[PDB]
């Protein structure tokens, strides 16, 4: 079963587990900030094989991002729900 691709990048954080080669981030529910704006929060992530844990951690960056803009009630979370083999989706609960 396809786990480690290891052609330049491979499983990190939790090695030997399920990983997704992040090619791009997709934001769902975001109305205050566009994908582009939130993507810079993940600027250092894609092009690599991020594991689910790192994928969820990516969303935490955005959840705090909104808070600093005044949206303290806002939280971004990665619901997974069978993530695409390249596109990762994060749910932005702005309020």
Automatic annotation (TrEMBL):
Protein name per UniProt: ShlB/FhaC/HecB family hemolysin secretion/activation protein
Originating organism: Pseudomonas aeruginosa (strain ATCC 15692 / DSM 22644 / CIP 104116 / JCM 14847 / LMG 12228 / 1C / PRS 101 / PAO1)
Signal peptide: none
Domain (Polypeptide-transport-associated ShlB-type) ranges: 22-95
Full protein: residues contained: 55 to 134 of 545
